[PDB]
Design a protein around this motif. Sequence first.
Motif, PDB file in Angstrom:
ATOM      1  N   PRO B   2     -80.755 -81.253  -9.950  1.00 14.25           N
ATOM      2  CA  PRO B   2     -79.988 -82.466 -10.265  1.00 14.25           C
ATOM      3  C   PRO B   2     -80.484 -83.121 -11.561  1.00 14.25           C
ATOM      4  CG  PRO B   2     -81.440 -82.849  -8.406  1.00 14.25           C
ATOM      5  CD  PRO B   2     -81.387 -81.348  -8.621  1.00 14.25           C
ATOM      6  N   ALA B   3     -79.544 -83.608 -12.370  1.00 15.07           N
ATOM      7  CA  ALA B   3     -79.886 -84.218 -13.646  1.00 15.07           C
ATOM      8  C   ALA B   3     -80.816 -85.421 -13.456  1.00 15.07           C
ATOM      9  CB  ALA B   3     -78.596 -84.640 -14.384  1.00 15.07           C
ATOM     10  N   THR B   4     -80.635 -86.128 -12.348  1.00 14.60           N
ATOM     11  CA  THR B   4     -81.475 -87.282 -12.036  1.00 14.60           C
ATOM     12  C   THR B   4     -81.726 -87.338 -10.537  1.00 14.60           C
ATOM     13  OG1 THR B   4     -79.574 -88.793 -11.739  1.00 14.60           O
ATOM     14  CG2 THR B   4     -80.528 -88.673 -13.948  1.00 14.60           C
ATOM     15  N   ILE B   5     -82.816 -87.992 -10.150  1.00 15.76           N
ATOM     16  CA  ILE B   5     -83.094 -88.202  -8.734  1.00 15.76           C
ATOM     17  C   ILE B   5     -83.351 -89.705  -8.663  1.00 15.76           C
ATOM     18  CG2 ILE B   5     -84.540 -87.767  -6.739  1.00 15.76           C
ATOM     19  CD1 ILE B   5     -85.278 -85.056  -7.865  1.00 15.76           C
ATOM     20  N   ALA B   6     -82.417 -90.415  -8.039  1.00 15.35           N
ATOM     21  CA  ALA B   6     -82.489 -91.866  -7.912  1.00 15.35           C
ATOM     22  C   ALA B   6     -83.555 -92.332  -6.939  1.00 15.35           C
ATOM     23  CB  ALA B   6     -81.117 -92.412  -7.458  1.00 15.35           C
ATOM     24  N   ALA B   7     -83.961 -93.595  -7.070  1.00 17.49           N
ATOM     25  CA  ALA B   7     -84.947 -94.158  -6.154  1.00 17.49           C
ATOM     26  C   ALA B   7     -84.434 -93.951  -4.737  1.00 17.49           C
ATOM     27  CB  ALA B   7     -85.145 -95.660  -6.442  1.00 17.49           C
ATOM     28  N   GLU B  12     -82.580 -81.078  -4.590  1.00 14.64           N
ATOM     29  CA  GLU B  12     -82.914 -79.689  -4.295  1.00 14.64           C
ATOM     30  C   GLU B  12     -82.808 -78.888  -5.580  1.00 14.64           C
ATOM     31  OE1 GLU B  12     -83.916 -78.619  -1.393  1.00 14.64           O
ATOM     32  OE2 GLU B  12     -83.566 -80.473  -0.258  1.00 14.64           O
ATOM     33  N   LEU B  13     -83.769 -77.991  -5.807  1.00 16.12           N
ATOM     34  CA  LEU B  13     -83.763 -77.187  -7.027  1.00 16.12           C
ATOM     35  C   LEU B  13     -83.891 -75.707  -6.702  1.00 16.12           C
ATOM     36  CD1 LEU B  13     -86.049 -79.015  -9.584  1.00 16.12           C
ATOM     37  CD2 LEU B  13     -84.868 -80.067  -7.671  1.00 16.12           C
ATOM     38  N   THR B  14     -83.336 -74.878  -7.579  1.00 17.28           N
ATOM     39  CA  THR B  14     -83.444 -73.432  -7.441  1.00 17.28           C
ATOM     40  C   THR B  14     -83.757 -72.901  -8.845  1.00 17.28           C
ATOM     41  OG1 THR B  14     -81.754 -73.380  -5.670  1.00 17.28           O
ATOM     42  CG2 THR B  14     -82.370 -71.282  -6.666  1.00 17.28           C
ATOM     43  N   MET B  15     -84.681 -71.955  -8.914  1.00 15.03           N
ATOM     44  CA  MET B  15     -85.080 -71.380 -10.183  1.00 15.03           C
ATOM     45  C   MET B  15     -85.399 -69.901  -9.988  1.00 15.03           C
ATOM     46  SD  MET B  15     -85.601 -71.881 -13.367  1.00 15.03           S
ATOM     47  CE  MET B  15     -86.276 -70.855 -14.723  1.00 15.03           C
TER      48      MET B  15
END
Lengths: 83, 49
Positions: B2-7, B12-15
């Motif tokens: 995600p471009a940002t993660i709000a308070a 979730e990320l995948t690489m």
Amino acid sequence: ALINPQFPYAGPVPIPGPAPTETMPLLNYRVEGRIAGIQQARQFMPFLQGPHRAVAEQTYHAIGTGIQMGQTFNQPLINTQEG
Amino acid sequence: APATIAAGATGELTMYYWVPLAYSETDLTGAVLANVPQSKQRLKLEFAN
């Protein structure tokens, strides 16, 4: 090439050239290379060397058995024609 | 990712990474022959924290 007189092409690139470096040397490579891991004689495959049947022929076994038995009915006697 | 993660949010990320031995699928320069049983390879991964 064309040369034109009186403007002639210099007769060389002359002695005013700027030697820029002495980095000309390729240092010979000296090396010892060892690829020696234990080898085990075998590899596993799904199948190697088989020439699988595309169609089989029809195949069979054989039997017979029994005896010679019979119930019979015969033609009646008839008058003989000639002879 | 995600471009940002709000308070208060969870992202979730995948690489994916390709760690090469061989240079490419057709050029085996750099490949490793590993058919020697007792002698293992090691791929060390140091992750972010």
